[PDB]
Design a protein around this ligand. Structure first.
Ligand SMILES: [Cl-]
Ligand SMILES: [Cl-]
Length: 171
């Protein structure tokens, strides 16, 4: 397997197959391994980036996850003042981690490359949580808060979906 983004070392986590062949995916179990400190001696810090809309996040998210659905906010939070460490790892996810999560992952790498001298990166190691929140919640409810799951297409949030999308950079 290839080295991480800055070609400094191998990827630390075991991966699983995912739709986007060029990205690295991890399972809910591996996400829990990170959250339970199984890699504390090597991983200084990791950030779980929930790329879903605010109402989805509010309806139930992974503990400690940060809601950064808008590209400009994800960039500001992660690259304005890079989180320095050991390793730093980013884990992106959305509802199914089919579109929004992967898109933000690619976006951050694009920006990371743009503000660095090749091949250096602030976040050389990034993963996608396979199955997204939809598959994580049924496996580890006590690692979520609140302990619920609100889909993007929830019937009671149709207006909220439209409101949020009109704030995005492109549709
Ligand atoms: Cl997938
Ligand atoms: Cl956006």
């Amino acid at each position: 397997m290839e080295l991480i983004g800055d070609y400094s070392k191998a990827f630390l986590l075991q991966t699983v197959d995912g739709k986007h062949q060029d990205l690295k995916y991890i399972s809910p179990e591996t996400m829990v391994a990170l959250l339970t400190g199984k890699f504390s001696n090597i991983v200084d810090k990791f950030v779980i980036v929930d790329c879903r809309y605010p109402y989805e996040y509010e309806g139930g998210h992974i503990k400690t996850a940060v809601n950064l659905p808008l590209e400009r906010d994800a960039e500001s939070f992660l690259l304005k003042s890079p989180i320095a460490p050991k390793r730093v790892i980013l884990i992106f996810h959305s509802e199914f981690s089919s579109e929004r999560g992967p898109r933000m992952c690619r976006f951050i790498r694009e920006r990371d490359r743009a503000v660095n001298d090749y091949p250096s990166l602030y976040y050389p190691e990034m993963y996608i949580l396979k199955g997204g929140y939809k598959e994580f919640f049924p496996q580890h409810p006590n690692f979520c808060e609140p302990q619920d799951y609100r889909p993007m297409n929830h019937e009671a949030f149709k207006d909220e979906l439209k409101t949020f999308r009109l704030k995005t950079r492109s549709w």
